[PDB]
Paper text:
The chloride ion is directly coordinated by Arg522 in the native C-domain, along with Tyr224 and a water-mediated interaction to Trp220. Mutation [name] also resulted in the loss of the chloride ion, with Gln522 making strong hydrogen bonds with the backbone of residues Pro519, Tyr520, and Ile521 and a weak cation-π interaction with Tyr523. In place of the Cl− is now a water molecule stabilized by Tyr224 and a network of other waters themselves linked to Asp465 and Trp469. Furthermore, a sulfate ion was present in the active site, making direct coordination with the zinc ion and surrounding residues of the S1 subsite, including Tyr523. The replacement of Arg522 with a lysine or a glutamine causes a decrease in chloride affinity, in agreement with the structural data. At 0 mm NaCl, [name] shows a marked increase in activity over both C-domain and R522K with Z-FHL and AngI, suggesting that additional interactions for the 522 position beyond chloride coordination are important. The most noticeable effect of the [name] mutation is the greater kcat values that increase with substrate length and are even higher than C-domain for AngI. Taking into account the structural data, it is likely that the lack of chloride coordination allows for more freedom of movement at the S1 recognition site, particularly for Tyr523, thus resulting in more efficient catalysis. Chloride coordination appears necessary to stabilize Arg522 toward the catalytic channel, thereby promoting catalysis of substrate.
Residue numbers in the entry: 40 to 434, 436 to 624
The structure:
């Protein structure tokens, strides 16, 4: 009856803490020390956690969740009824676990080399090339090289991966893996809600796109930019053209109003990766939110190791299910882009700390988008010229020209990301549901790159190419839609918190630093964890239960008016009517 259900939940929680804590550190040691020994221990602990998941997941399935009164106990048991990979027969499970490891390792050790010269890693080398080089062929070298070495090498593993992850999904009651991933949001209208939100950001994105295309035309020449076509994917300062902020020097709306070199400022003033996290820690505590434990500073990998060992460099935050042990793993470079990233990862850590008293099953964000959005919200305030100047990193100010410059800087990071973050799982959901087969992987990737982002490949794609594999989340099997949700909702959070802090006038000038009223709304929402449906947490922060693009539109409203006037006087076509155009 009801007593057996709550007894089971107690027992699940006690044993999960112990086994999840042990899997986490085995996983940590591989991620921070990629060897054969650490690989083998991880694969052994994989079967141990599966053994636990199988045991309690089988017991969970004997209960009737909707025939149980307490909804909190109902919520936990339903979740435990999902075995994930542990639903696969023993042979399939080890094959799947090996495939995952082999995709992750291949991506992380991939290098692009000159014939008789240096071998370059993605971070920081190729990253730096995409950010700083302004030569078409040198950008092309890194862009094509990374796809030849990382993307092409992932292709051999992917079809089998898709089969095994879909098999696990079906055995847990889903139709495919995409269906399983979407279920995390507990929102029947998810796909429609997301498309509506994407459509609302069209006026802003098409105008940014057109403006940037014009500036690329000016710099890279008329023979390489079609003013009515898609932009070549290697020219936006980022390996995946997901954020366009590194090409700010090519697009600055008012060159007469220049801003400080932030990296030069950081490096000169002796900014260390450690200081960047200390400053993020300060922002959280200023809001009355929890500080990171002394253990965090002892066990975290806050920069790339010098011992010449292989690591997973991608930035991640870690919960060890201790209630005491939380870590960040990041190959941090001393610049503004990574300062934003440091806050984002610290946002994860705060979330871990805020819901640490809940049963481990409920230890997750309201939805995965919420988990991503926390650090980004605070970072929106750090990014203001007024806050950056107070860190001695800028000098921008009370001026209309500097104001439009800042909004362009923010838009190249925030608006540009919208179509990309949307695109990734659109391709992926259709791969899981069978709409896209291995014969059309890459072609359907680029149809969507064209359709949503208005980008084209600088070099025509050949057989054997698998460019999705050259993006971290693909071989690592981490979903991507949260980042889309995060970017919409983080402005909703920013708007509400700014109001709660008593700030008036344009939204983009708001800095919530030290606001205890804003901290309170965040804390109460974060404490809920995964115990309640997400619209409850949305309500707690914003005073309303919906996802909405209004906050983002309002934030960038001054920029949209400026972009419309600017694109109008140059006679720009919005979009890419000549959609079949590729470089000669
Ligand atoms: C359904 O079962 C759940 C879980 O057993 C019940 O939720 C629990 O309710 C108690 C209060 O009735 C919560 O305790 C409170 O929180 C802290 C303790 O850490 C304390 O500072 C407060 O003063 C208060 O005692 C407890 O946290 C909460 N547990 C969870 C996991 O949410 C719930 O009451 C049951 N529902 C019904 C309708 O009976
Ligand atoms: Cl690509
Ligand atoms: Zn994140």
């Amino acid at each position: 009856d009801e007593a057996e259900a709550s007894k089971f939940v107690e027992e699940y929680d006690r044993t999960s803490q112990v086994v999840w804590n042990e899997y986490a550190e085995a996983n940590w040691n591989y991620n921070t020390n990629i060897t054969t020994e650490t690989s083998k221990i991880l694969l052994q602990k994989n079967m141990q956690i599966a053994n636990h998941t199988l045991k309690y997941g089988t017991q969970a399935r004997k209960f009737d969740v909707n025939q149980l009164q307490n909804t909190t106990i109902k919520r936990i048991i339903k979740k435990v009824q999902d075995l994930e990979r542990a639903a696969l027969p023993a042979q399939e499970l080890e094959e799947y676990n090996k495939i995952l490891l082999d995709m992750e390792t291949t991506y992380s050790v991939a290098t692009v080399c000159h014939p008789n010269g240096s071998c370059l890693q993605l971070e920081p080398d190729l990253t730096n090339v995409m950010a700083t080089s302004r030569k078409y062929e040198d950008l092309l070298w890194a862009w094509e090289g990374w796809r030849d070495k990382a993307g092409r090498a992932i292709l051999q593993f992917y079809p089998k991966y898709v089969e095994l992850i879909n098999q696990a999904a079906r055995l847990n009651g889903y139709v495919d893996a995409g269906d399983s991933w979407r279920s995390m949001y507990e929102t029947p209208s998810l796909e429609q809600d997301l498309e509506r939100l994407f459509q609302e950001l069209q006026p802003l994105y098409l105008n940014l796109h057109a403006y940037v295309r014009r500036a690329l035309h000016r710099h890279y020449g008329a023979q390489h930019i079609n003013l009515e076509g898609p932009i070549p994917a290697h020219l936006l300062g980022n390996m995946w053209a997901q954020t366009w902020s590194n090409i700010y020097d090519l697009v600055v709306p008012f060159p007469s109003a220049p801003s400080m070199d932030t990296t030069e400022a950081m490096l000169k003033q002796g900014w260390t990766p450690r200081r960047m996290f200390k400053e993020a820690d300060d922002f959280f505590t200023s809001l009355g939110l929890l500080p990171v434990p002394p253990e965090f500073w002892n066990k975290s990998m806050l920069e790339k190791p010098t011992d010449g060992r292989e690591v997973v460099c991608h930035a991640s935050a870690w919960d060890f299910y201790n209630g005491k042990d939380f870590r960040i793993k990041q190959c941090t470079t001393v610049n503004l882009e990574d300062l934003v990233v440091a806050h984002h990862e610290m946002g994860h850590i705060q979330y871990f700390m805020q819901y640490k008293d809940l049963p481990v099953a409920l230890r997750e964000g309201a939805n995965p988008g919420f988990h991503e959005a926390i650090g980004d919200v605070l970072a929106l305030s750090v990014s203001t010229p007024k806050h950056l100047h107070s860190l001695n990193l800028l000098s921008e100010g009370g001026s209309d020209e500097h104001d439009i410059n800042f909004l362009m800087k923010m838009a190249l990071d925030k608006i540009a990301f919208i179509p990309f973050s949307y695109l990734v799982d659109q391709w992926r959901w259709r791969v899981f549901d069978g709409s896209i087969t291995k014969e059309n992987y890459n072609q359907e990737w680029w149809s969507l790159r064209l359709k949503y982002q208005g980008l084209c490949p600088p070099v025509p794609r050949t057989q054997g190419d698998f460019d999705p594999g050259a993006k971290f989340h693909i071989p690592s099997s981490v979903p991507y839609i949260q980042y889309f949700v995060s970017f919409i909702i983080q402005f909703q959070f920013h708007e509400a918190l700014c109001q709660a802090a008593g700030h008036t006038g344009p939204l983009h000038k708001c800095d919530i630093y030290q606001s205890k009223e804003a901290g309170q709304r965040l804390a109460t929402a974060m404490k809920l964890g995964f115990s309640r449906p997400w619209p409850e947490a949305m309500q707690l922060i914003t005073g309303q239960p919906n996802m909405s693009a209004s906050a983002m539109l309002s934030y960038f409203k001054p920029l949209l008016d400026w972009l419309r006037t600017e694109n109008e006087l140059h006679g720009e076509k919005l979009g890419w009517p000549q959609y079949n155009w590729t470089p000669n």
